[PDB]
Design a protein around this ligand. Structure first.
Ligand SMILES: Cc1cc2nc3c(=O)[nH]c(=O)nc-3n(C[C@H](O)[C@H](O)[C@H](O)COP(=O)(O)OP(=O)(O)OC[C@H]3O[C@@H](n4cnc5c(N)ncnc54)[C@H](O)[C@@H]3O)c2cc1C
Ligand SMILES: Cc1cc2nc3c(=O)[nH]c(=O)nc-3n(C[C@H](O)[C@H](O)[C@H](O)COP(=O)(O)OP(=O)(O)OC[C@H]3O[C@@H](n4cnc5c(N)ncnc54)[C@H](O)[C@@H]3O)c2cc1C
Ligand SMILES: [Cl-]
Ligand SMILES: [Cl-]
Ligand SMILES: [Cl-]
Ligand code: NA
Ligand code: NA
Lengths: 581, 576
């Protein structure tokens, strides 16, 4: 009674024009008639009836029949006729310079580039770094490599190593008596040397695999045409049968006087030629807290200014516990939003400047304008998609209010040969390994015709605060909101990592884990949360439990490794709030 | 009717006979029990339930008899118990519901769980001193002379390497050599142990467990004789016994061994820096101890018969050897033939031992000596069960001194159970001892079918670079399924924490995933050489409880940046 999904998508990938049809074929000639206009031959497949629902779910279209052009699902006749009518289909059916043009040389872009090339495709990768307002710019590899996960983790490690020196003394290492300072210049140089090695590793990796790299900023000027502008101002034209947008985000600045003149962002922090000194971190994002955390850990006076709550979107119980701990470690939290930044001093080549930060502070007997002076202000309120100058209007790629591209999965909802992955895809969790997986999987779908989907649910994270926060699945609140207080079991414990047992570390009273369970479905695990050293290393493997609908009973029959923090997930009995014969 | 209903009844009733159809001599049971004014309860088991119930209790055929919630077998085994007088003494009231011989990982965990289920329990614990005179408090091997002190000294070693990283991340540490003071480390470790000793001793009182610091021996069918430090002998009776007595370090039949060589029982309370150290043996204990002693700046030699880590993946063992060699540990394939004491330890200084070896040169074989401050005898661990009176209760032991189980029930005595290192075939790990204890207590006093899972147990060897594993070695998988049906996926990686350093570890971190090719790359085992191997291995180990495939590892989204995410992006196949 027909053929199946894999056979359909293989044909779809192999053939120039494929019509996939079910029970009936009204307008088959209208399609064949429409393509005959461009001397194109239309291939056919009768799909098995008990396979259609699966095929439709995968491509994200409501009903049959389906039309593919050069291995891209277009929809039905309605969508094809729109493409023909606009002249886009005429230009689409032409030969183009590249099988795929990738706009962005970051996590997703590079991963997609390597995977497309492994599948024997001609690919162009475009990457350009518009400087920050402070003038800061960098090499290939994107946010993660240059101004994100990598530099952040290295400075976090600089901070942990500070706490490790004190433990070393308590385990009996005879460290001479002096106060011990962190030299910012050595740290920043060590970080920038590593980044430099990655910049060059990716640049080489692209050459070794015959990916055409262009250090040019790309904009759509045709249906199948990017105009790309290099550093010196040279403008070239690049054509492709398909486009992938993996452009990412840049730090958000608020509409406040001085913000842009006075406040660095994460784009600037990791190549600062000076110790940032007394620092104000503005915002409640994980970036704000991670940066506040390590700056404290390397000995700076650190303040964090937040609108209301920390880590909006994370479990607020865990957020509060991070707040308690970072407060005990000497970070100062104030609930205020600056109304003006005034530059008192400019940075020299080796010393920080000075900014006067203005706030409206509340008495009981009235309201006061208040100022406080900081060496450095880090604007860390969020990250925005900077897609206004991409010419997505020219290719008719629908965007959300926020500037992100709206997907039918990774396919532009409105344009079948433009795809988006990574931070710029509306609703995509903003993580490197998601950008990487989305890229690699998309490239296998497009050029192999496989049914593999990226799994965007139950993604584990770690917030690399001074005491790390690992999580996967629902917050306690989301579980209770969705299923009812009455149907949720929360199993939890405190614990002292054995490494801390011999020390008088503040961490000894803050390590906590909890497991959130659906009571009415055998304590199905909905989420887990842990506050510990090495939270990332613990959370990663436990996260696979959610792919198999793991129950509490599965955590309980898993034998621990002793002595570790991780084994704590194995012996939870405490709930948060005899043969009787 | 069904299994849960059978085992509930079995736990609730004094004497229960479980049957299928019209079993032969169900009368001669009721007749036998009528002798002791006992009522024999009955249950007709559903046919669809029998094979399940028999698998659980570990008996071949169906007419089953329970006594005080203990599965005895069939009429044959009951008659044996009656004939020996044991059944008569069993049906009497006794002082305790359960007597536990051993105050270690298993014993204490069983004690806490029995008491939570409302039972009167006595826990017996005594520590016979080492040959060097060393002794310690409650909590067993792990607390006093095992996992806990070992991991703390391992961390002392790691913190040594962390000081050097601190300089490369820009911490201005005053210049010149930094020494580890052994006395501060040993005191810090012993202070922690002291807190655990006391925590367990209090924990037992708080829960009304009777603790007796006495060494126990069976002198009746249902009677232990227990001897305290001062030499006082008391008698303890119970309706059931749990043996959770553990092991002690093995010494070889070699002149001087016992006089000259410390064991792990002595190492963690040594009143001196051990100095130039010889570690004898290939066990994880030998290598872990060799590793940290090197990490705190000692001249360390390891002497092995042939291979390291017998039982572990030899590819990973070789990689551990290469790394520890690069970190300055000296490996020689020699077995000492004599130890001669040159000096006794005195005044917080180590002694000196002359170690004799047969080495061959271009002419033949010659006796050779080398001098060490300290020799750690770490060849293995044996069950010291000769003096337990297991002959009196008729608890069968294996050649090695371990108790032979029908699961955790003595194969030969239905009211005696064993868990932990002393149960024949039980992996020798704390969390196994703990789970076996807790689960057994729920079986015995709740009548649940819950079994401890003894397969696919994750471990970590806390060598200077940690080795984490779960499931088959490459070799076991190839031996069992054929090289043609095994995919080995692997990678090297540099922990980001090392990227900025000149560490030796940067060339030794490796992971591999062992897959059954003919069953969609079903994961049979995984192995990783990395910092925090324990923390990474624990959660990945749950994948094997669900018959995880490579595809499950591939659709799991990594946490960046971590070592663990490496299990998410393996593409390279090891070819051989
Ligand atoms: C401070 C910080 C810390 C982070 N920490 C973590 C973490 O610990 N773990 C984690 O998983 N994630 C972390 N992230 C997020 C992670 O970096 C992002 O999710 C990921 O980098 C997004 O990758 P991408 O490929 O989608 O975009 P990007 O990596 O940003 O790459 C987009 C690239 O395209 C370039 N580009 C933009 N427009 C154009 C154009 N028109 N033409 C050509 N090129 C263009 C951009 O300049 C950039 O080079 C962090 C982010 C930040 C800012
Ligand atoms: C150096 C070393 C490192 C280890 N590292 C690890 C590790 O990292 N992870 C891990 O999981 N496992 C580790 N182990 C193993 C772990 O210690 C054991 O597996 C575990 O302690 C076994 O617990 P148990 O209850 O079986 O026995 P034990 O903990 O040995 O308890 C037995 C107790 O019973 C006492 N006893 C003996 N006979 C009698 C008697 N007749 N009457 C009364 N009391 C008696 C003993 O003296 C002792 O007090 C390590 C072991 C060693 C030696
Ligand atoms: Cl780190
Ligand atoms: Cl924290
Ligand atoms: Cl530590
Ligand atoms: Na025990
Ligand atoms: Na004791």
């Amino acid at each position: 009674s027909g053929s199946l999904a894999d056979a359909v998508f293989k044909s779809a990938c192999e053939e120039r024009i494929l019509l996939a049809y079910a029970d009936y074929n009204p307008d088959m000639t209208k399609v064949v008639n429409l393509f005959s206009k461009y001397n194109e031959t239309v291939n056919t497949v009768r799909v098995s009836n008990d396979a259609v629902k699966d095929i439709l779910e995968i491509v994200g279209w409501p009903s049959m029949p389906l039309i593919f052009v050069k291995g891209n699902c277009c929809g039905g006749f309605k969508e094809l006729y729109q493409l023909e009518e606009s002249g886009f289909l005429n230009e689409w059916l032409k030969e183009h310079e590249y099988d795929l043009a990738i706009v962005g040389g970051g996590s997703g872009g590079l991963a997609a580039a390597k995977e497309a090339v492994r599948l024997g495709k001609k690919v162009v990768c475009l990457d350009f770094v518009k400087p920050s307002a402070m003038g800061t710019t960098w090499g290939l590899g994107g946010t993660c490599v240059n101004v994100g996960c990598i530099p952040k983790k290295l400075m976090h490690q600089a901070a942990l190593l500070g706490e490790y020196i004190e433990d070393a003394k308590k385990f009996g290492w005879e460290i001479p008596e002096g106060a011990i300072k962190l030299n910012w210049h050595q740290l920043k140089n060590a970080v920038q040397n590593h980044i430099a090695s990655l910049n060059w590793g990716y640049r080489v990796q692209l050459k070794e695999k015959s990916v055409t790299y262009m250090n040019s900023y790309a904009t759509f000027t045709g249906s199948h045409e990017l105009s790309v502008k290099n550093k010196k101002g040279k403008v070239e034209k690049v054509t492709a049968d398909r486009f992938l947008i993996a452009v990412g985000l840049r730090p958000r600045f608020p509409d406040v006087p001085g913000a842009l003149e006075c406040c660095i962002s994460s784009d600037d922090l990791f190549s600062l030629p000076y110790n940032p000194g007394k620092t104000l971190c503005v915002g409640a994002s994980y970036v704000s807290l991670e940066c506040a955390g390590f700056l404290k850990g390397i000995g700076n006076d650190v303040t964090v200014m937040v609108r209301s709550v920390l880590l909006r979107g994370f479990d607020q119980d865990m957020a509060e516990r991070i707040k308690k701990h970072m407060t005990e470690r000497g970070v100062k939290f104030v609930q205020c939003v600056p109304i003006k930044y005034e530059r008192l001093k400019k940075p020299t080549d080796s010393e920080p400047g000075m900014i006067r930060v203005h706030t409206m502070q509340e008495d009981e007997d009235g309201t006061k304008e208040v100022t406080e002076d900081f060496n450095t202000v880090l604007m860390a309120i969020g990250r925005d998609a900077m897609t206004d100058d991409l010419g997505l209007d020219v290719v008719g790629v629908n965007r959300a209010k926020s500037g992100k591209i709206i997907g039918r999965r990774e396919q532009s909802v409105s344009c079948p040969y433009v795809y988006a992955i990574g931070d710029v895809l509306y609703g995509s969790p903003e993580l490197t390994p998601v950008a990487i997986q989305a890229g690699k999987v998309l490239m296998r779908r497009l050029f192999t015709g496989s049914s593999e989907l990226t799994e965007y649910d139950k993604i584990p994270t770690t917030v690399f605060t001074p005491l790390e926060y690992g999580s996967c699945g629902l917050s306690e609140y989301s579980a209770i909101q969705k299923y009812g207080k009455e149907n949720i079991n929360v199993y939890h414990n405190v614990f002292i990592p054995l490494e801390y047992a011999v020390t008088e570390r503040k961490e000894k009273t803050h390590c906590y884990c909890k497991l959130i369970c659906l009571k009415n479905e055998q304590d199905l695990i909905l989420g887990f949360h842990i506050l510990t050293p090495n939270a990332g290393e613990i959370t990663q493997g436990f996260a696979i439990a959610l792919k198999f609908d793991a129950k509490k009973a599965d955590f309980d029959r898993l034998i621990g490794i002793h002595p570790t923090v991780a084994e704590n997930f194995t012996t939870l009995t405490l709930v948060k709030e005899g043969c009787x014969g």
